[PDB]
Amino acid sequence: PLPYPFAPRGLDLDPAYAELRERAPARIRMPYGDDAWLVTRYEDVRTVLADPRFSLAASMGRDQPRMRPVARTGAGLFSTEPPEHTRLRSLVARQFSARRVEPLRARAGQLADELIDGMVVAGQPADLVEDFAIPMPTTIICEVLGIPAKDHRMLWHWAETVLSAITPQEVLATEGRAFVEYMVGVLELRGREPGDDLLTALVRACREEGLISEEELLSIACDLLIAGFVSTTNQIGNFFHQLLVHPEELTRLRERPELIPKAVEELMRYVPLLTGFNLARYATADVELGGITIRAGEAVMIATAAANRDPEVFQEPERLVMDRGANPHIGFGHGVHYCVGAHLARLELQVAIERVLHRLPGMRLAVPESELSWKQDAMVNGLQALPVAW
């Protein structure tokens, strides 16, 4: 069985995936848990994500293929399938819809300008990671959820604990307990002190309409916070890294920002992001796939970055093509667990690029590229620092 996941080399896609896509799904061994089938062919990955015989509910109570020593528990979005999943996801779908995140664009741009101001005053070189990529989306999600600004540093510390694949088992537990107790507290605050935030809406949904349990309310609050903290923070840095090493693409996006949406989608397709956070599904019945049979009770994982370069789906899949037209990438997933944050992340990535490129027309790497350090043992690929001058 193939040891998995591969060790990332920057944001290179591992060359093994090219051969993997042209054979039957492979048997893989993760750091912990059951062995699994690994699916990399685009069509095979879409099938796993859309076919209800592949279930995240069925993985609860199993010895899941995973990165960390303790199998995951919980009763929320990552643990359920329809109809129960639908009941939870319906309650969050209003606030994260494109229609309701779009009014945040002006605020996101104002925040980006404040962060860039801070970089300017601090003087060159700046670090796009610590000075911009981390603060921007963490602030925004906190505002969406009604989380006080004072808790930013504490929550980023928890995010780093969550993000490291070598966090000691007992550190994860003790910090985890503290985080959960923190969120219990916030949910009581929102109960006494209602606001125009998402958690207030979710507290009412639970404690006045009885539409979700307390355990579900808590899991959704925790999930949205953690997701908001570990995802875009890394991806913003990744996208600026890719723009900085393709300077030819910079000036088009700087001068014609209407081109930024398609570029964000191409960068979503191109960037290999998810080293560790790939939830295995368990089959609930035998499924024929890729010429093998996945028996009931077996585990299946997907490689979206590999699917996103399947040459049967994307022309010249290994080329970064910033105006790429046919781009049905799986960078936000597919099926019922399709990213509920997709419109918010999309807006954050577009605004980040628009603001940074306009504010800092002379932006460039402040160190040689070979000197960049990538985060080691991270569940999500990302830079330790991104030194820039301008």
Ligand code: HEM
């Ligand atoms: C570039 C940024 C992001 C990327 C690449 C990303 C990617 C993904 C992917 C691939 C999935 C599917 C996982 C699976 O099917 O196993 C997912 C699900 C999810 N994401 Fe995102 N995400 C991003 C930003 C966000 C943000 C900002 C939030 C919340 C504010 C968020 C919240 C969630 C949640 C709650 C789920 C589970 C949905 C469900 O099971 O119904 N994500 N994300």
Ligand SMILES: CC[C@@H]1C[C@@H]2C[C@@H]3C/C=C/CC(=O)NCCC[C@@H]4NC(=O)/C(=C(O)/C=C/C=C/[C@H](O)[C@H]3[C@@H]2[C@H]1C)C4=O
């Ligand atoms: C970067 C883009 C996407 C953003 C989303 C963020 C979310 C991560 C939530 C993690 C929460 C966490 O670690 N909480 C502390 C321990 C509690 C419990 N114990 C576990 O071991 C565990 C997990 O392993 C959970 C794995 C979930 C993985 C999901 O794919 C990604 C998803 C990414 C694809 C648990 O939930």
Ligand code: NA
């Ligand atoms: Na400007």
